[PDB]
Write a protein that binds this ligand. Structure first.
Ligand SMILES: COc1ccc(Nc2ncc3ccnc(-c4cnn(C)c4)c3n2)c(OC)c1
Length: 256
């Protein structure tokens, strides 16, 4: 097939993602340059839902200038019936990639970590807290990890393993809540499992996330700095939890 976005024609090479209201296509332009078009159908969307999309688009727009750790959005076309967004094409999402590889290089993990931190930090500067970080929110774009969404818009092909105790306790959120979710991801690339994956019952799991008494397992590893970063990220009390700016000045992110 084919599609037009602001007079520019793109040919559909493959469909990258499936969403209830959206699809992601791998496409090529007239110049034969690859791009990803997120198509969102607006035929049956509530006004509240519409506002969220407008917020996530506006966010992708301003940040562009601030950082390259956020996926580049080249162009967009919005109508009552649909939303078309011209973005850069990544090799793969971080979740799909993680499942594929049994073991991850220490150097790669350090590079991906510094990229995640730098991107999340940018969103925080503007006052945005994702509160829903998971690997799928990340995308490998030629050795660089980029942030796809701020979580306002619907995710595509959910988990509870990356949820911070303060989210569940409120039932508040702070940039420190994003640190918890990131620490889980890092903990996953260091131990191959999320801190609470071992609990079957999702109710018991939420209890495990919020129980001070429950103690997270931190097995001995060659990288002491790496071990230190995890321990510092997964402190149940956010006031006692490390910050992104501090994490950027850590030995692990700066010393190999
Ligand atoms: C799982 O396989 C892929 C995931 C992502 C990509 N690339 C890519 N590039 C830009 C994107 C922009 C927005 N959303 C996605 C996305 C979200 N979920 N999935 C799934 C892809 C993008 N994926 C891919 O390319 C060939 C394959």
């Amino acid at each position: 097939q084919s599609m037009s976005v602001k007079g520019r024609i793109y040919s559909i090479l493959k469909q990258i993602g499936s969403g209830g209201s959206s699809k992601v296509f791998q496409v090529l332009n007239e110049k034969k340059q690859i791009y990803a078009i997120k198509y969102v159908n607006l035929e049956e969307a509530d006004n509240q839902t519409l506002d969220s999309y407008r917020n996530e688009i506006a966010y992708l727009n301003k940040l562009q200038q601030h950082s390259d750790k956020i996926i580049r959005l080249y162009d967009y076309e919005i109508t009552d019936q649909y939303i078309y967004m011209v973005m850069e094409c990544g090799n793969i999402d971080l979740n799909s990639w993680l499942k594929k590889k049994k073991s991850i290089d220490p150097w790669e993990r350090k590079s991906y970590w510094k990229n995640m931190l730098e991107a999340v930090h940018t969103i925080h500067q503007h006052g945005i807290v994702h509160s829903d970080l998971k690997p799928a929110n990340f995308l490998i774009v030629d050795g660089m990890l980029k942030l796809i969404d701020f979580g306002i818009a619907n995710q595509m092909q959910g988990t509870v393993n990356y949820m911070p105790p303060e989210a569940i306790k409120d039932m508040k959120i702070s940039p420190k809540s994003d640190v918890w979710s990131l620490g889980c991801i890092l903990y996953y690339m260091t131990y191959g499992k999320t801190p609470f994956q071992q609990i079957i019952n999702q109710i018991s799991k939420l209890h495990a996330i919020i129980d001070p008494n429950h103690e997270i397992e931190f097995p001995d590893i060659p990288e002491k700095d790496l071990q230190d970063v995890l321990k510092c990220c997964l402190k149940r009390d956010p006031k006692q939890r490390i910050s992104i700016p501090e994490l950027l000045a850590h030995p692990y992110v700066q010393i190999q």
